Symmetry: C2
């Protein structure tokens, strides 16, 4: 229950914003079932900055899109709790709207990241963040990294 | 990528054992699809000691027991990576034998913990761990309903 210290409300995160370590990194998603691409990317996003905030679609909100799952099999509190259990995540915030734009406006990240192959120029939130001089970028889900090759290289040795 | 520092082989962990913070806590499982009960359980296991090590059954190992489904949805390295990403987990080791008995022999944990109401006296590793002055105990673990589980597996497959 200790990782639950990361679950926070938009209002509380807004009050705390000024005291967060720069650069503040933001990402959002449904995160219905965590897989390795999710955590690999959650870790790299953390590595870009000093602080990582994850926005999580409410159950109603998730119902707003036809892209992914209309109805997530895990309730928003459970999806958020899993994220909070992660070493690389600092803060987990839910949002109800269909897009994370007003959440992002409130949070004011220095860096916005998306996991997957997504044209960042087609995203409203990219424009929002770049609008005040921040950065927006897509981090691929599974890519061959130097840190991976190395650590496992280490594994064979045994 | 940083989290992968936790994936290690039995031999290297055994050599490193003496310098780990005592008491060393051990638990093992398949951990196919993580849910909130898993992470709640792993945090409670961590709170029992100063260091947490997770034994992860190999695909092959999973084929030999009647727990859950005969086959897993995620390969061993993905299941181990998911666990290693958890804040509360310190070391993730994969074993190939039917049970974790030999691994526990090599690791020498000071505390063996299982989730659920399980007669610990019926486990060989309990006697083993108690035999060298360690502890073995069960702590409550919340399982997800079979339906949700079946829906989860399906989702994974998709």
């Amino acid at each position: 229950a200790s990782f639950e210290r990361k679950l926070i409300t938009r209002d509380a995160l807004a009050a705390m914003r000024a005291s967060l370590p720069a650069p503040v990194v933001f990402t959002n998603g449904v995160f219905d079932i965590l897989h390795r691409g999710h955590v690999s990317y959650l870790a790299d996003a953390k590595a870009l900055g000093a602080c990582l905030i994850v926005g999580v679609n409410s159950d109603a909100s998730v119902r707003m899109l036809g892209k992914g799952d209309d109805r997530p099999i895990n309730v928003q509190e459970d999806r958020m709790a899993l994220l909070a259990a992660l070493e690389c995540v600092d803060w987990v915030v839910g949002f109800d709207e269909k897009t994370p734009v007003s959440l992002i406006e409130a949070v004011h990240p220095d860096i916005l990241v998306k996991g997957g192959d997504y044209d960042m120029d087609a995203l409203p939130e990219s424009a929002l963040v770049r609008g005040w001089g921040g950065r927006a970028l897509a981090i691929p889900f599974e890519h061959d990294r130097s840190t991976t090759a190395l650590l496992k290289k280490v594994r064979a040795q045994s």
